Design a protein around this ligand. Structure first.
Ligand SMILES: Nc1nc2c(ncn2[C@@H]2O[C@H](COP(=O)(O)O)[C@@H](O)[C@H]2O)c(=O)[nH]1
Ligand SMILES: Nc1nc2c(ncn2[C@@H]2O[C@H](COP(=O)(O)O)[C@@H](O)[C@H]2O)c(=O)[nH]1
Ligand SMILES: [Mn+2]
Ligand SMILES: [Mn+2]
Ligand SMILES: [Mn+2]
Ligand SMILES: [Mn+2]
Lengths: 321, 320
């Protein structure tokens, strides 16, 4: 339930598979690698896995190749990090009935699907919880480990810009930079790594932009054929919904992205007050008050857009009193 | 001079004018207001001024209206912050050698033009130096003052992206947020305030973009008529050079901007190693190892661009 029990369980087991969520992000990579490396420093036999391609922006990060897609491994313990439901780890959810499991997560909707669960939504990033676990285990940080742990705190707060960048976030960042975290490397690789093809793709997104409610709601979409024409994938569009939110006067931005064929990811971002996690959760996804999402399979963009936007529109209009 | 002498000088004067630089940025607003408000807590009569319009993105900040353009004031002491030479403060340079003056700055090419000068280029922002002065003066931060002092640290590190975001930057940011700095407010006002017209403007920047040296140099330009065509000003283009640096593989980005007619501002940004301040300084400007600029008056943009690019390319090879 709490950190102390999870530390004990981690200490009790030797052969550990650490698993993160599909469509991984910086906090997934950060949490998986920081815990994996910490456990290896203790002398444990560990592998790391995500049922998804790792985005190109992580290619230069130290030890990124320890995250596998198809590990061959006989674990005594499964550790699932940064993932709110079993569906979020893809094919590794088949291990949940076979191998004892620990969940470590900061999402408030986490279904507590492990044998042991430490879920604390007062953190901005699961990487903050791994930092505390590692310190409680006595793991000594070098600059690479500090850089890897800094990654998730930076990305989940928008590099200290979002509503979740509180005192504890800045304190953790300071501690990690003091330990040698390369904050410039992290920002360069995540934020200054744009393929030029992105700009043309984003122009098409602006072309298709739709405005509702005096311009306070904005949404657009990228169908699969459009990714193809621009020689782009979902890795290329990762910053787009935040760019739509940055438009003056917009309170909610929504981007629908079909990649690969038939899989529609819906990203939602809000600015001052609208709780987008409430919309996402009711649609079957999850997230946070200012950033949330949901994913559909086998469905048509002509049906997802009205279903999502009509539900969002209703909840937005109700949010006035 | 060191900080301790400057703190002594500040304590010795009760009527003080705090001045920042023309074309003000976040560190200028941050430094000017944080020092002014700090000194006022000692009971002193303090005015703040910049010989320039304050950009729109600062208009919701607490006490922003304290920065005047035309103060009517007889100070005993002039304090110049975040400005590397007398020219950078516009008409207030006329006060030098008439009112005793203090310079507080983090630019390495500061000409030391005050009677007292504390210049420390190891800081990422002059706001960090103002923070330490206010602490030495013994004043108390509330959340408004913490937010105003946080502003310059945030903007001058590119919100913790630039290579100047060292451990001391994160320590200061932590201490200010602990005192109530509203980091989310600062980011939203500066970065989430984009006009639709800005996106059309940037599209023109991308149409004129050139990549040189196998994609390691990116440059473009905005002429005056293009600003007008898009109903934009140079306030709309303020983040553009950073967007060009964010292209994969680009080491240095350069943006030439003519606004208003006959004034050409050249903005430069680099990623890993190229010292753009050496280029800017040699052309008559200044700045920092990874961010620098120069401004020309009365010159033709079609003449400035090939000469600046030629000098840049020459320095780029020598740096290699
Ligand atoms: N449960 C769940 N949460 C999601 C899904 N997609 C996005 N999220 C949540 O929404 C946040 C933002 O996702 P993004 O819009 O960046 O894809 C994530 O941090 C995650 O918490 C999804 O398919 N399922
Ligand atoms: N001396 C001098 N420095 C400048 C000038 N323009 C820009 N800089 C320097 O270059 C940096 C970046 O300028 P920006 O590109 O953001 O306009 C500034 O922080 C400042 O130190 C100028 O006209 N003169
Ligand atoms: Mn995640
Ligand atoms: Mn999340
Ligand atoms: Mn400045
Ligand atoms: Mn400067």
């Amino acid at each position: 339930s709490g950190m102390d029990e999870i530390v004990k369980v981690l200490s009790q087991h030797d052969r550990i598979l650490v698993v993160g969520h599909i469509m991984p992000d910086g906090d997934c990579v950060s949490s998986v690698l920081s815990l994996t490396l910490g456990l290896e420093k203790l002398g444990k036999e560990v592998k790391a896995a995500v049922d998804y391609k790792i985005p190109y922006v992580f290619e230069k990060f130290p030890y990124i190749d320890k995250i596998e897609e198809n590990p061959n491994f006989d674990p005594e313990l499964l550790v699932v990090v940064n993932a709110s439901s079993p569906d979020r780890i893809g094919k590794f959810q088949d291990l949940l009935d076979k191998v004892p499991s620990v969940v470590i997560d900061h999402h408030s909707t986490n279904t507590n699907f492990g044998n042991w669960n430490w879920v604390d939504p007062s953190f901005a990033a699961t990487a903050q919880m791994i930092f505390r676990i590692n310190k409680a285990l006595g793991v000594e940080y070098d600059s690479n480990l500090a850089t890897l742990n800094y990654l998730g705190i930076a990305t989940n707060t928008g590099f200290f810009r979002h509503s979740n960048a509180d005192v504890r976030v800045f304190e953790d960042a300071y501690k990690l930079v003091k330990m040698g975290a390369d904050a410039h490397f992290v920002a360069k690789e995540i934020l200054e790594n744009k393929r030029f093809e992105q700009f043309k793709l984003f122009a098409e997104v602006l072309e298709r932009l739709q405005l509702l409610e005096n311009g306070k709601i904005a949404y657009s979409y990228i169908d699969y054929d459009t990714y193809l024409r621009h020689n782009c994938t979902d890795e290329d569009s990762a910053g787009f919904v935040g760019e739509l939110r940055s438009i003056r006067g917009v309170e909610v931005a929504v981007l629908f992205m079909e990649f690969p064929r038939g899989k529609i990811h819906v990203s939602m971002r809000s600015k001052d007050w609208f709780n987008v996690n409430e919309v996402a959760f009711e649609l079957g996804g999850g997230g946070h008050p200012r950033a949330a999402g949901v994913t559909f399979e086998g469905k048509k963009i002509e049906e997802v857009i009205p279903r999502v936007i009509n539900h969002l529109l209703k909840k937005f209009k109700e949010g006035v009193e």
